[PDB]
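Person: I have long wanted to understand how a fold can be written as tokens. Underneath my words sits a plain record pairing an amino acid chain with its backbone structure tokens. Those tokens are not coordinates but codes from a learned vocabulary of shapes. I should like you to check that the lines agree and flag anything odd. The protein I mean follows directly.
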Amino acid sequence: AGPWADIMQGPSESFVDFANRLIKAVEGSNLPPSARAPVIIDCFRQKSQPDIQQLIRTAPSTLTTPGEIIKYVLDRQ
């Protein structure tokens, strides 16, 4: 279990704050730099609040970066 496992969006935490903690826990880990982006995305899918999880599952497959997912959530939530 990597340092992201402990990181899940709280019942009253804004997604951006959840994203911040998570990105922190991923960036300070032993993962190679090149591996951070795709791990961050999986965590967004698995560790967010349920409403946010369905939002990310419905999203266009053309969102490829953590930054596009964040922007998508903030605009549409």
